[PDB]
């Protein structure tokens, strides 16, 4: 639905530095500031058989402020803060041209260039001294070496031109910058006096690649001149993509989902392989984390730990206690590594199978999806604790059972004896809950080994029963998949 | 959490690396590495 299109071109980038000067008073001997300034430039050049018109803008950063001041006397020479560029300073050259490629520069999958370095040398500036020997600025040079292309925009008068920004590094060069007829010799670097040396333009040549993502709702019919710019793009409605994600569960499978859920999914494993733009593949993971932190579930984790810490120094009746410890068990499940099938495994599996078959179209929207699913998926779940072959099972809705392992018949529950063990003994997610398990034992009479395995939520036995095509387990896991509805 | 508090975690890690404990752990690991290198 979103098609890659390569637009790699060989370009010639022409640019010139901008010089701003501010005079200090008196009779005209001193100066206040000599500094680099943003500089525009227009040109045209022949390439590939057509004349392409280009617009460039040069700017400087990291600039040093040398100084020189002959004293407080009202005629002694000096420049209060005269700049230079050296190792630290960078120069950006925003580049634009009328060619077709720059119309399709909104969404990009990749972008990188190869430009040839250049040597910029300083000119000759005759500081305007009213009388006497003429001071002479001369010399100084650097070399621009390309390092990295990014997106950018010229805030040009008539419109805002989306453009490519080339960040060139620097390298000080041989000619020792001097203030001749004056006390500054054998410096090195390019000062702001006359960075252009009278040249009409400093010139670079190279080749830049680009992989745009022009949209497509049909194979044969691909567009030109991408014009769905962020003026023409707007927030997809929250309920709208909620409905889309809910609809996506039309297609999810039964056993393949469990097979995926039995992976270790990490940051790289999930968030890689998303057909996204460059601006979102840069920080998708951090974007997801930022909104994951403030989710109701995450602040519930924080409240649990802080409440326990504060308690460390502070010193249907059953349904309420069971429900509260059920929420607590959900929190514990999320924070710790359980050895069972662990409902959040299934939640993450559904999440991956949903997001993989989507696309990023100028807005991340994995925030509000990953973090929202983390809290909404599988709203009512169940846990259990086995002890002495009398497993006590609990539901987040408040229900409770206590049934034997060898034969699945329940027993009167023991509140405050389940609570002593739920703190320390390992909790087992009940993906095969007591009701479905009783159905399975009644209809398909099972053995001690597989009974214990299903109680423990062993992936081996779960997949064995799924691949037996057991209707009970098949239907149960299908409903498990179906509550994942955001 | 008064007002845009800094990164507590990374701020503490800024010099939890240089503690006596961390230096000792790195020292032990590099000692085993040198033992591996030279029998």
């Amino acid at each position: 639905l979103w098609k890659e299109m390569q637009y790699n071109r060989d370009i010639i980038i022409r640019f010139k530095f901008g010089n701003s000067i501010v005079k200090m008073g008196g009779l005209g001997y001193k100066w206040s500031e000599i500094s680099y300034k943003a500089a525009n430039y227009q040109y045209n050049y022949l390439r590939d058989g057509e004349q392409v018109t280009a617009h460039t803008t040069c700017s400087v950063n990291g600039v040093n402020n040398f100084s020189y001041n002959g004293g407080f006397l009202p005629t002694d020479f000096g420049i209060s803060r005269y700049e230079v560029i050296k190792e630290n300073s960078y120069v950006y050259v925003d580049y634009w041209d009328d060619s077709k490629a720059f119309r399709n520069i909104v969404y990009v999958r990749s972008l990188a260039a190869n430009l040839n370095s250049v040597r910029c040398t300083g000119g000759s500036y005759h500081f305007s001294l009213p009388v006497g020997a003429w001071p002479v600025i001369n010399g100084g040079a650097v070399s621009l070496h390309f390092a990295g292309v990014t997106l950018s925009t010229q805030f040009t008068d008539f419109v805002s031109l989306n453009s490519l920004r080339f960040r060139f590094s620097l390298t000080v060069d041989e000619p020792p910058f001097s203030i001749l007829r004056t006390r500054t010799v054998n410096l090195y670097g390019l000062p702001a006096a006359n960075p252009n040396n009278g040249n009409e333009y400093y010139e670079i040549s190279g080749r830049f690649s680009l992989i745009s993502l022009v949209p497509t709702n049909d194979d044969y019919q691909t567009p030109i001149m991408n014009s769905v710019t962020v003026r023409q793009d707007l927030e997809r409605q929250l309920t709208n993509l909620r409905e889309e994600f809910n609809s996506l569960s039309q297609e999810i499978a039964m056993a393949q989902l469990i097979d995926l859920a039995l992976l270790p999914l990490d940051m790289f494993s999930m968030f890689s392989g998303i057909k996204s733009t460059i601006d979102l593949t840069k920080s998708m993971a951090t974007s997801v984390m930022k909104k994951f932190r403030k989710s109701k579930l995450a602040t519930s984790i924080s409240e649990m730990t802080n409440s326990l810490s504060d308690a460390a120094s502070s010193a249907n009746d059953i349904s309420t206690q069971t429900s509260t410890i059920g929420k607590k068990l959900r929190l514990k499940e999320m924070i710790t590594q359980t050895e069972g099938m662990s409902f959040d495994d299934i939640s993450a599996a559904v999440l991956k199978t949903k997001i993989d078959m989507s696309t990023q179209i100028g807005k991340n929207t994995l925030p509000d999806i990953v973090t929202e699913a983390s809290e909404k998926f599988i709203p009512k779940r169940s846990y259990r604790i086995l002890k002495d072959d009398e497993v006590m099972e609990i539901n987040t809705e408040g229900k409770f059972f206590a049934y034997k392992i060898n034969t699945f018949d329940e027993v009167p529950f023991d509140v405050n004896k389940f609570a002593e063990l739920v703190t320390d003994s390992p909790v087992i997610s009940a993906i095969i809950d007591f009701k479905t398990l009783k159905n399975l034992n009644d209809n398909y009479g099972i053995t001690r080994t597989e009974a214990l395995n299903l109680i423990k939520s062993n992936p081996n036995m779960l997949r064995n029963f799924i691949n037996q095509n057991n209707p009970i387990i098949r239907n149960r896991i299908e409903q498990l998949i179906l509550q994942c509805k955001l | 959490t008064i007002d845009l508090t800094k990164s507590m975690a990374t701020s503490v890690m800024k010099k939890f690396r240089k503690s006596k404990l961390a230096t000792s752990i790195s020292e032990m690991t590099n000692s085993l590495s040198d033992a591996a290198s030279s029998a």
Binding site: L260, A261, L262, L263, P264, L265, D266, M267, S269, M270, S283, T286, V288, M289, K290, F292, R293, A298, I301, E333, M334, I335, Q337, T338, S342, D344, D345, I346, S347, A348, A349, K352, V370, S374 | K6, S7, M8, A9, T10
Partner: peptide, 25 residues
């Protein structure tokens, strides 16, 4: 597969220095 939620929570500290990037920039 649940490992990713734990990874998000554990590694969430870096969002602080990411928003530091955003505000300093």
């Amino acid at each position: 597969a649940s490992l990713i939620y734990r990874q998000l929570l554990t590694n969430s500290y870096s969002v602080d220095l990411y928003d530091e990037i955003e505000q300093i920039g």
